[PDB]
Design a protein around this ligand. Structure first.
Ligand SMILES: O=P(O)(O)O[C@H]1[C@H](OP(=O)(O)O)[C@@H](OP(=O)(O)O)[C@H](OP(=O)(O)O)[C@@H](OP(=O)(O)O)[C@H]1OP(=O)(O)O
Ligand SMILES: O=P(O)(O)O[C@H]1[C@H](OP(=O)(O)O)[C@@H](OP(=O)(O)O)[C@H](OP(=O)(O)O)[C@@H](OP(=O)(O)O)[C@H]1OP(=O)(O)O
Lengths: 603, 603
């Protein structure tokens, strides 16, 4: 309400402290009004002296904040012109190089980068202009409010004697700067095409939140409703219309991956909504284009659509109304549709989003030959917690290639055959390597980062933490195969195994609480066990995260060990399936604090 | 982009012609720019005289439109001043009467009515201010556009010489007016409470469409999705899970009403959406409070929720999980929930809407005594199209009270008993009166209107129209009972019956095309077979309405005749079911044109 929430919505995520503290002056004026001693206990001289002293303190605070505004604006303007001169020099160099093939491609990439730089400079200039306008509006509003409450005209005199003569308000150099940038872009860059110049230099109202179209919200609601009703009917159909002829392992073992993917997309949508609400400049961190970024609603829509596809495919797998090929087409059809959706080459269905995502995925998969950005290793750590999809895909390809009789029906082939359990076994080695692929990719990425930076800490320690999983999985496999062979010394390999269990968790957990989040700092001060500046209002969120992460790390390591070792022949698959949709929740809660730590400590 | 859509959304409907014809100015300037031939083709003298003559014509047109705007503003200000004087006199009289029981209640209703009058006055003055500001903005906008396209500075000089001195902008009496009204409201009425004074006089941004919350759209989507999935599963369950041993009539004949009502609500939501989009001032016509009106989204939400309840009740009726009572609680429970939803006495679940609708329904059901508004007889005619709900309700009461053995099970009592078919008969004759109730109410309303106005040409004939249903139903009942008795002269009563068929349709259809819509106008002729002015862009809508209404009138009259005559033992309920959900569509298509015609002629 009023200018208060307007300013609060128009806060720049970077310079939040530099803005006028409308709330502070608001509450201190109400504090002035609230005291109000008894009407007849003392002379009106005391009341007027109280009014005068509080007015003097109000003027002192206003002058202090005004001086801070002047200094901040002058400094900002200083680097504004210095950056303008630097970009003008670069533009002149590029133009004179062009005026006088590989050279043409270099000029093309340079001018495109220059256009992007001019775009961000124009955003900076308009941000400064909005800064000045918001400060002026806040000053006029607070002075009017004060003149109203104190029923005096002193606020107007203070404003006219201070504000309209303030250097920040009197300086119009920002307008000449933006006009010169616009003219340069129109003339030198666009060759007189003013329309294209503006179209590239548009600035959508980022300050006014985001005008989400009603159609997107309606579609999200429709998809959510259809998904929940399909889920309910799936539960009822599974409970009632299922008979007993086979233990239904393959169906869950195949659809667990789709369930994990859908849950991950939903949680990432919640994650980005919280990121936007908290004020963390995530778009800058991911070097995304500020013109076009995906809000949470699109992620919710995509998650709902994939959930619909998965649920209908699984329900068709149960019921199987009528066909010629009985049941082993639905999972294949669903996965084919998903993979084709991901690689759609037309300019439809978020073409830029899919292109950028697949480019990032190719970069992260070929990481040993690429640099390290924040969008790269974050996706690598995202994939590190989703080894279950790779496991399920390998199991599905094994089942459909070797075990399943392709030209047959039903799909409950006898388990008494020797070929039953070919990849329910582990001596093939096709389980340890698949599980360790994410760890290997992440570790080699960290090693390349260290080599590029030439700085041992913290990259070597990080590489060790990523490499502990190698020992974990390999020794679990050794124990499993030696138990299969029934050797006398096999039990010995159990002992140190448990040791390497602990040296994993208590290790990585520490890495999760010192460098990833920067908590437990020596300068906690008033906030025991926490950090000085926390964006989220409540510390109970931090407490629940710190109490859940310790359990979830043990859960993840034990679940990956049992998945790759396949002991406990009955309950092993059940424990793996039940523990799978918990590490994803851990990965969801981890991102909040990871980025709120990175945003403050840029580093 | 430009201010085109800005004004097109911000133009007040009832003064749309008075605003700037900015679009015409755009297109004429674009035509002027495009018509210029090549430089080499024509001499520069011809080019310059072209610019000179078109500039002169542009200035002439702008002078004409500004003169019209000044005259309009002067007249508006004069009537605003006279209205202000009148309301000041009324306030003075009220306050001096108050200063010097029934008298207190009269004073209370006077002060509330005066508060409403001041609200309307403040809204009108703010509308005038918005008009003036938009006109000034449009002038400066088109002038700078002309200056940029003609690369001349003549526009600025013309603006400062004409627009700056223009009487509409120079007259600042509007601000003194609003300040005086605000001061009077704060002091005389609110007794110094400025906060309550402005909150009662707050004006939401009606010009900027409507900021619909995203939560409402999400809820609408969720309800629509759940409804469509429940509909599909109900269709499949009815096709497969239902057998045929005792027919399904005693179920559809009770569950038709919920579908009818839900369809009516959905179509009414469509009506209000189209009404808002086309610009027809429907809120003024219904004397609704302009600050609190229901957009289409709320109607869609209510329709979806009722659809969910009805579909769930029907689905539970099919499968019928059994604890004690087999099947005859679901319809009663659903109807009880609906009626309790309508009569909720708390302040939740649309507190104002339900109270207003209940008051209107009571007023229309006490038609012979209370007066006539617009919403009154509009709702009367709206209910005249839904006699099927009353038919189904009385049939439900008849079945549950007499035929149904409530202390039994199943719900498929044999039809071989003598009492069976009594409720399928008409010996009591209740069908005729139940069907003829809406006609009687509408006739009484028209008779009261005629008596009050003492003018027979537009009222007495209106009453005479609604008496044909009486003769139709009575003659149908006579034919049915004489056929049941098998008298020799029975067939004779058929003959005139068919006659009174035609004298119904060809009569009321004419009434639907002359006074209800104002079509076929002799004074017209700009558009063949249409009126002088239309609001919807396409005449094909009028053509399809005029081609469908002729069929629908015959359909409605034959369906009511067959419903109340109890003939065609096999196809009777079938024809009733297939014809019922289309008369509501006829009412839906009728409302649009009825209100666009009532908006202009003002009968
Ligand atoms: O792209 P828009 O948002 O519609 O901007 C239009 C206009 O473009 P159009 O004439 O095609 O409508 C001008 O662009 P050009 O004609 O010069 O190519 C532009 O110019 P300036 O910013 O330099 O004034 C000006 O933008 P703005 O909204 O900031 O005033 C504004 O002009 P019009 O509303 O008069 O058309
Ligand atoms: O919050 P609003 O009801 O929209 O109005 C507030 C304010 O009330 P608050 O004291 O609760 O903040 C003033 O109320 P009064 O003390 O004068 O009764 C009012 O004053 P004016 O309308 O006379 O200016 C002014 O409204 P406006 O937005 O038109 O300036 C605006 O105050 P602020 O926006 O400056 O905080």
């Amino acid at each position: 309400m009023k200018f208060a929430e307007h300013l609060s919505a128009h806060i720049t995520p970077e310079w939040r402290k530099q803005y006028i503290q409308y709330e502070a002056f608001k509450d201190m004026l109400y504090s002035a009004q609230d005291q109000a001693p008894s009407v007849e206990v003392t002379d009106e001289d005391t009341v007027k002296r109280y009014f005068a002293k509080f007015e003097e303190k109000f003027f002192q605070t206003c002058e202090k904040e005004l001086a801070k505004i002047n200094t901040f604006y002058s400094e900002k303007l200083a680097e504004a012109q210095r950056r303008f001169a630097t970009l003008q020099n670069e533009l002149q160099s590029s133009l004179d190089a062009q005026k006088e093939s590989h050279e043409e491609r270099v000029q093309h990439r340079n001018i495109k980068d220059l256009k992007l730089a001019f775009s961000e400079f124009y955003l900076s200039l308009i941000l400064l202009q909005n800064y000045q306008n918001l400060n002026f509006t806040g000053f006029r509003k607070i002075l009017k409010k004060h003149d109203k409450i104190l029923e005096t005209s002193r606020g107007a005199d203070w404003r006219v004697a201070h504000v309209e003569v303030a250097p920040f308000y009197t300086c119009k150099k920002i307008n000449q700067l933006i006009s010169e940038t616009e003219a340069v872009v129109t003339n030198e860059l666009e060759d007189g095409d003013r329309q294209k110049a503006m179209k590239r230099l548009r600035v959508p109202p980022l300050g006014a939140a985001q005008p989400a179209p009603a159609w997107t919200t309606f579609r999200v609601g429709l998809f959510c409703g259809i998904f929940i009703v399909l889920n309910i009917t799936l539960v009822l159909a599974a409970v009632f219309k299922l008979e007993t002829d086979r233990s239904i392992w393959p169906l869950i073992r195949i659809y667990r991956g789709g369930f994990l993917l859908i849950e991950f997309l939903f949680l990432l949508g919640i994650n980005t909504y919280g990121w936007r609400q908290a004020g963390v400049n995530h778009v800058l961190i991911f070097e995304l284009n500020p013109r076009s970024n995906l809000s949470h609603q699109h992620l919710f829509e995509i998650a709902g659509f994939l959930g619909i596809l998965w649920c209908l495919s699984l329900l068709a797998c149960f019921f199987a109304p009528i066909s010629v090929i009985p049941t082993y087409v639905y999972p294949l059809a669903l996965y084919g549709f998903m993979v084709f959706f991901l690689i759609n080459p037309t300019k439809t269905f978020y073409y830029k989003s899919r292109f950028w995502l697949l480019k990032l995925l190719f970069r992260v998969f070929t990481a040993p030959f690429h640099k390290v950005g924040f969008a790269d290793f974050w996706l690598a750590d995202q994939l590190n917690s989703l080894s279950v999809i790779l496991m399920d895909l390998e199991y599905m390809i094994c089942f459909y290639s070797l075990e399943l009789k392709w030209d047959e029906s039903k799909g409950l082939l006898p388990n008494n055959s020797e070929e039953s359990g070919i990849c329910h076994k582990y001596t093939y080695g096709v389980r340890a390597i698949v599980q360790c692929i994410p760890a290997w990719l992440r570790f080699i990425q960290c090693l390349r980062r260290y080599r590029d930076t030439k700085r041992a800490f913290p990259h070597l320690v990080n590489a060790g933490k990523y490499s502990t999983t190698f020992f974990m999985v390999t020794f679990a496999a050794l124990y499993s195969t030696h138990k299969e062979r029934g050797h006398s010394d096999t039990m010995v390999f159990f002992y140190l195994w448990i040791v390497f269990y602990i040296i994993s968790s208590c290790y990585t957990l520490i890495w999760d609480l010192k460098m990833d989040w920067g908590l437990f700092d020596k300068n906690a001060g008033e906030n025991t066990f926490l950090r000085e500046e926390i964006v989220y209002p409540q510390k109970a969120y931090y407490y629940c995260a710190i109490i859940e992460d310790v359990i979830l790390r043990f859960a993840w390591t034990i679940q990956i060990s049992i998945t790759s070792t396949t002991l406990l022949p009955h309950s092993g698959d059940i424990i793996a399936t039940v523990f799978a949709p918990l590490e994803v929740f851990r990965r969801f809660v981890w991102n909040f604090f990871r980025l709120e730590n990175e945003h403050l400590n840029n580093c």
